[PDB]
Write a protein that binds this ligand. Structure first.
Ligand code: MG
Ligand code: MG
Ligand code: MG
Ligand code: MG
Ligand code: MG
Ligand code: MG
Ligand code: MG
Ligand code: MG
Ligand code: MG
Ligand code: MG
Ligand code: MG
Ligand code: MG
Ligand code: MG
Ligand code: MG
Ligand code: MG
Ligand code: MG
Ligand code: MG
Ligand code: MG
Ligand code: MG
Ligand code: MG
Ligand code: MG
Ligand code: MG
Ligand code: MG
Lengths: 124, 204, 211, 205, 147, 95
RNA sequence: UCAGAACAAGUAGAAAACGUGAAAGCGUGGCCUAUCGAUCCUUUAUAUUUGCAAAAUGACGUAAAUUACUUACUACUGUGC
RNA sequence: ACGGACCAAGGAGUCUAGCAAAUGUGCAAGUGUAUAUGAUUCUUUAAACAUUUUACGCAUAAUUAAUG
RNA sequence: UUUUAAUUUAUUCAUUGGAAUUUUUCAUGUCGAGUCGUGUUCUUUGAGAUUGGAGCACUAAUACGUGUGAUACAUUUCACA
RNA sequence: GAUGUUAGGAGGGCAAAUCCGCCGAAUUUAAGCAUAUAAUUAAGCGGAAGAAAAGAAAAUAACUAUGAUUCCUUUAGUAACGGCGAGUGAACAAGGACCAGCUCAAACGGUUAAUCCUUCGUUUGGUGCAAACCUUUCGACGGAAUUGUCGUU
């Protein structure tokens, strides 16, 4: 929701459309008068929107309102912010790669020695 | 008071008079058969402290156990496996000599009796000598008495053979309650089994 | 091992198949247990199958805030209630010889609870009709009509369950009442720093006392 | 699950290579026709099966409570919708309203006959007839594992309180009963097919 | 279910998908983790850098409880109040909410994120990060140490 | 880690006396027996040796005695206790 | 070299501190291309960095205070590991 | 080069544990009601329903040998 | 049929014994030894200067004791037994 | 102390899935193998019960503290151990199931063993058609017991 709000911050009254789910954010204190079309609203998010005196539109509704999508703004969530994506790319072992190794837990005993510090053979 | 005094005396052990007595007693034992009934406890106070009571069905038995490690039973000294398991001669038994003593008497000698307890008595370099307190679970004197009667139950057959006498409790490592004993508490084997147990769930 | 998968840590190198318990019996077992409980209740006509446990605070820095039922009431609490341990045992209450009180407030709470329980309870005479007063702690034996009335009413199990948290976590407070000067982090860190020396001092004090 | 030692209770071992026979383990000794024969191994008469079935296979499947609830809701919705019900196979051509609501008097019916009559009156005569027809001997070995007859699934009567409904509908083929409080998705959507014909008491509703 | 298993799809091919020249033998690369640091060293290097060797201090008796301290950032502090109450608080600059962060099941307050300006917050907790405390104060709030 | 019995606990989670605000709520016969035992049994050889060492009188001698005790009984504390007892006995004898 | 992993050997720097020269400069070894070595373990250096799991040990140090389970405040706090 | 006289039946990537990505679905800063209880639940009922008129997991914060 | 709840009827007279609290005195009792423990050997343990056990050698203390409080040790606290 | 076909009794063997002691491997894994791993497993031997074993703190904790065992959910694949390789690997807390405590020894009681048992009995009951049981209190004649039974806590 916070992200949505941020996005909407420039142009008002136009309708943000999100082709996914919208979740609420406890980190936000205020919610502006938002008109949002989504595939899914989490209940709490929906409630928040309602409170804001806003509007929750489903995709069909949006279509009905704006068959050419006039005055609409497409928004996406952060895709590569997913935990899976953190393991991808260059594998940990290749220099300067920022990928999370698949490990059991965290702490000293777990993948923090040889090849992770100058002091144990090599680093990274 | 008398019993306290004798306890105190027995604490000394190495003090001349006590020592002499011990020497005498061990000498006497060396002569007597390996298992032999005794007329009366030679350590009455000690017997009392354990399970002994002055009742008809209570018997004291004296038993001699050889000291030292137990050579690992094999044809010739050779072991036929990995080096880690190859040693003999310096292999120790998991049971106490006391436990062994109680076992041997309780078994083929006194199958009818029930081992209640056992105490130390005396030793030499060859043998440790124990007096074992036993009870007849069929004697009415024992059957009636609400204190003791428990031993009359069938669950107490050959306690000595299941490590349920004090000595058994010791070597089973039940004596030391605490974090020192986490691994063995309902029973070592039982505990191990529990730990192994993978619980799947019909639902899963 | 191959590809980017987690390193295999499946402890199945022993004869594990020898010790697999599948709980096909779970629900049915539960049902059986329930039935047994019911039977027990029936046997103990009127009386509740559940025994009184005191509320107690959980150990460790992490469960400290929570309160749960402990087993047994402690002699002191029994005394406060105005009850003998044996008497308590005979009735609904669990007693704990080993438990000790270091919290006066806690003790008070426990005694209050005990009192409440006592108030709630009505005692059926040991021999019929013959109404006689209890021993040490046990209250009084009521008449027959009263007993009947009680029976007719539903036996509550509210006391045998632990009292849920008081709630707060949000309370209004005035802005003028706030203290703008209290570096809490600073205080913490200072405290941490000063620990060892404080401990030493305490030890010294103890030593002094011992003489 | 197949028994644990099935096919493997034998001491059979392979004769090795130089006897002009395959190297599968062979039953030892002589005199018997069994002696000399292939032992265990899935390909062998009297052998163990490939991966013998075991009790520790996952039988049950945990489903999100929420998911279950959702499913139930969906089923209910389907039941409400006439078309869906029709599709599901129930003979609903002669019923006015398909969210079927009936008076609390139903909860108190005491006689199967009476229940049947009521059903007929409602319009389910055809459905009842169909149900009657549809008790038939199952194709296959099911016949031998206590699944002799197959019967189609008729209406589902939902009630607030049992004052006879349970017993009065018991014995009518395909008719199922349920308390509003504990609705079963297995019953509301048999075979995972949406839109069972539900008859609701007003109280139940 | 078995019907949608690849083996069923490969059923009429000879090698069952496991290669004609290089067959499918039992445990080729070794058993379990096997030649980690020998024939499978490269894999270890590339996917599991710091696997081998031990680092740092032993800790013979841990007791994770002693060290348990669930964190919350200030950013999420005002969220901990219901919407209507929050609104009320916003309206009334005169009164500041106390928050028992421990009662909500958290042991440390950290300072990741903004707090609404001017609005004073009273924060009850066991631990605070300097920055979080500073943030709280800047907004006219107090931290009250609890135990 | 360490706490004090007197004084309420500072409402901090760490440091000395840290913790919650909750206010806290707070022979002859034997000797005779021992004497009797002594009369009966006397001492044990090691004990006698220790006594002798003590009698010898110097700091070095005392140290030696202590060492001997440690060797015999095991554990430093026990040995120390034994030594103390022996010293007491010696003193009594002197008196 | 290469997986564009490591080690190793280099190349370019940067922050110190210097050496040399009048100075620009040059110098992080040998004019360049070879002369070498993981985990674990051991060993010895480094450090206002730590721990040894309820605590303490420099130090009742510095102030106070009264006889004591007193109150503050100090980067420096045993052996061994 | 090896295997195959012929025919019929049987005859071989399976099942579980944990991890993974893929995709489906529900919910979503949460989520999963774990054991266990409760029921006007009891042919099916070993399931289905319900969850006490701050349990724990994983996730929401990382990092350091470490007091932190 | 099995038992086991509820409901029903107990009422009188005899005194031998016991019990729980509650006052106040007086008593500070007792509390398990070739046992714990240490050293050493072997085994076992996730137990790491040894987790338990065992063999052998040595061999204790009296509740101000002595045993835990997961790094050996000394001096001393404290907490729990 | 022997001894008795003395009077009255008991033990032995079979059966094991769970159960409790002992005793005790190796294949195997480590792509070899020797420590490890298999495994405190199989086999061996001995012993019980409807469950066994465990159990009423020489416990954990460091809290505002918990309070016998056992079992489940969990901690946790964690602390730790491990040619620190392969691998192995708990416990406290927390949520439950169930919840039960106790008696010897020692202290005390000598204006007295107040105890206990064998045998022979004696006379009210309750059932059952019988067979039988079930209880009731009362003494003898023996013994055991002062090297210590019973009461008291
Ligand atoms: Mg077969
Ligand atoms: Mg067919
Ligand atoms: Mg092909
Ligand atoms: Mg092939
Ligand atoms: Mg090839
Ligand atoms: Mg060939
Ligand atoms: Mg041929
Ligand atoms: Mg052929
Ligand atoms: Mg075929
Ligand atoms: Mg997925
Ligand atoms: Mg004791
Ligand atoms: Mg081992
Ligand atoms: Mg601890
Ligand atoms: Mg037998
Ligand atoms: Mg062995
Ligand atoms: Mg191998
Ligand atoms: Mg191989
Ligand atoms: Mg076996
Ligand atoms: Mg049996
Ligand atoms: Mg038992
Ligand atoms: Mg557990
Ligand atoms: Mg985890
Ligand atoms: Mg193992």
């Amino acid at each position: 929701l916070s992200k949505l709000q941020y996005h909407m911050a420039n142009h008002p009254n136009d309708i943000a459309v999100v082709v996914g789910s919208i979740t609420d954010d406890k980190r936000l204190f205020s919610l502006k008068q938002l008109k949002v079309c989504a595939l899914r609203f989490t209940e709490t998010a929906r409630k928040r929107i309602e409170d804001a005196g806003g509007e929750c539109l489903t995709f069909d509704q949006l279509a009905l309102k704006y068959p050419t999508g006039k005055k609409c703004v497409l928004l996406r969530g952060p895709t590569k912010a997913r935990t899976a994506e953190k393991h991808f790319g260059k594998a940990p072992g290749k220099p300067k790669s920022k990928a999370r190794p698949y490990v059991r837990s965290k702490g000293r005993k777990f993948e923090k020695a040889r090849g992770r510090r100058k002091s144990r053979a090599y680093k990274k | 008071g008398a019993y306290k005094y004798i306890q105190e005396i027995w604490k000394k052990k190495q003090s001349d008079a006590m020592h002499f007595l011990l020497r005498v007693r061990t000498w006497e034992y060396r002569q007597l058969p390996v298992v032999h009934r005794v007329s009366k406890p030679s350590r009455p106070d000690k017997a009392r402290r354990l399970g002994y009571k002055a009742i008809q069905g209570f018997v004291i038995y004296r038993v001699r156990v050889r000291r030292g490690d137990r050579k690992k039973r094999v044809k010739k000294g050779i072991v036929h496996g990995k080096p880690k398991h190859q040693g003999v001669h310096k292999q120790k038994s998991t049971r106490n000599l006391k436990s062994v003593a109680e076992g041997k008497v309780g078994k083929s000698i006194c199958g009818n009796l029930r081992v209640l307890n056992s105490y130390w008595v005396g030793q030499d370099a060859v043998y440790k000598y124990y007096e074992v307190i036993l009870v007849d679970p069929n004697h009415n004197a024992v059957r009636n008495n609400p204190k003791i009667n428990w031993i009359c139950n069938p669950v107490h057959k050959h306690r000595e053979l299941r490590g349920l006498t004090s000595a058994g409790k010791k070597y089973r490592g039940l004596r030391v309650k605490g974090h020192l004993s986490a691994k063995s508490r309902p029973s070592i084997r039982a505990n191990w089994k529990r730990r192994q147990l993978i619980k799947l769930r019909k639902c899963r | 091992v191959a590809h980017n998968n987690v390193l295999p840590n499946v402890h199945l190198h022993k004869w594990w198949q020898h010790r697999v318990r599948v709980n096909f019996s779970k629900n049915i077992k539960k049902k059986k247990r329930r039935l047994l409980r019911e039977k027990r209740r029936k046997a103990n006509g009127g009386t509740p199958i559940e025994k009184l446990h005191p509320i107690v605070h959980c150990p460790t820095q992490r469960y400290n805030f929570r309160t749960r039922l402990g087993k047994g009431f402690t002699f002191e609490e029994l005394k406060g209630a105005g009850l003998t341990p044996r008497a308590a045992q005979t009735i609904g209450i669990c007693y704990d010889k080993r438990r000790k009180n270091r919290s006066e407030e806690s003790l008070t709470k426990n005694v209050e609870r005990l009192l409440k329980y006592k108030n709630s309870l009505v005692m059926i005479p040991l021999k019929k009709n013959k109404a006689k007063k209890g021993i040490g702690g046990i209250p009084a034996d009521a008449d027959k009509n009263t007993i009947k009335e009680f029976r007719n009413k539903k036996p509550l199990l509210s006391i045998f369950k632990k009292e849920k948290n008081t709630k707060p976590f949000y309370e209004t407070i005035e802005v003028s009442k706030i203290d703008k000067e209290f570096l809490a982090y600073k205080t913490l860190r200072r405290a941490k720093l000063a620990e060892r020396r404080k401990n030493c001092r305490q030890q010294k004090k103890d030593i002094k006392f011992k003489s | 699950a197949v028994k644990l030692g099935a096919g493997y209770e034998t001491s059979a071992e392979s004769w090795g290579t130089g006897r002009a026979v395959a190297r599968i383990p062979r039953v030892p000794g002589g005199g018997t026709h069994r002696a000399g024969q292939g032992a265990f191994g899935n390909m062998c008469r009297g052998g163990g099966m490939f991966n013998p079935t075991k009790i520790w296979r996952r039988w049950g499947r945990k489903v999100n409570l929420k998911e279950k609830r959702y499913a139930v809701c969906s089923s209910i919705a389907a039941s409400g919708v006439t078309s869906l019900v029709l599709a599901r196979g129930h003979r609903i051509s002669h019923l006015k309203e398909v969210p079927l609501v009936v008076s609390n008097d139903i909860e108190s019916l005491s006689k199967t006959k009476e229940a049947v009559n009521f059903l007929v009156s409602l319009g389910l005569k055809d459905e009842v007839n169909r149900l009657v027809k549809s008790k038939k001997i199952r194709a296959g070995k099911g016949k031998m594992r206590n699944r002799k007859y197959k019967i189609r699934n008729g209406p589902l009567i939902i009630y607030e309180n049992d004052n006879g409904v349970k017993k009065a509908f018991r014995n009518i083929p395909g008719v199922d009963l349920c308390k509003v409080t504990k609705l079963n998705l297995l019953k509301l959507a048999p075979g995972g097919s949406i839109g069972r014909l539900c008859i609701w008491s007003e109280s139940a509703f | 279910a078995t019907r949608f298993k690849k083996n069923r799809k490969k059923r009429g091919h000879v090698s069952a998908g496991h290669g004609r020249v290089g067959k499918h033998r039992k445990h080729p690369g070794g058993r379990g983790k096997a030649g980690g640091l020998h024939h499978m060293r490269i894999n270890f290097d590339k996917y599991h850098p710091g696997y081998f060797g031990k680092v740092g201090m032993r800790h013979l008796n841990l007791l994770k409880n002693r060290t348990y301290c669930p964190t919350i950032n200030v950013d999420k502090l005002w969220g901990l109040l219901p919407e209507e109450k929050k609104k009320e608080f916003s309206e009334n600059k005169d009164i500041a909410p106390v928050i028992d962060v421990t009662r909500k099941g958290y042991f440390k307050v950290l300072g990741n994120g903004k707090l609404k300006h001017n609005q004073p917050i009273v924060v009850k907790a066991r631990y605070f990060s300097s920055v979080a405390e500073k943030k709280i104060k800047a907004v006219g709030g107090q931290c009250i140490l609890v135990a | 880690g360490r706490k004090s019995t007197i004084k309420p606990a500072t409402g901090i989670a760490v440091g000395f006396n840290s913790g919650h605000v909750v206010t806290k709520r707070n022979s002859k016969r034997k000797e005779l027996i021992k004497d009797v035992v002594r009369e009966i049994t006397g001492f044990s050889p090691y004990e006698k040796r220790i006594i002798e060492l003590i009698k010898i009188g110097t700091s070095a001698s005392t140290k030696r005695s202590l060492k001997y005790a440690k060797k015999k009984l095991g554990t430093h504390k026990r040995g120390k206790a034994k030594r103390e007892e022996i010293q007491k006995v010696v003193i009594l004898q002197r008196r």
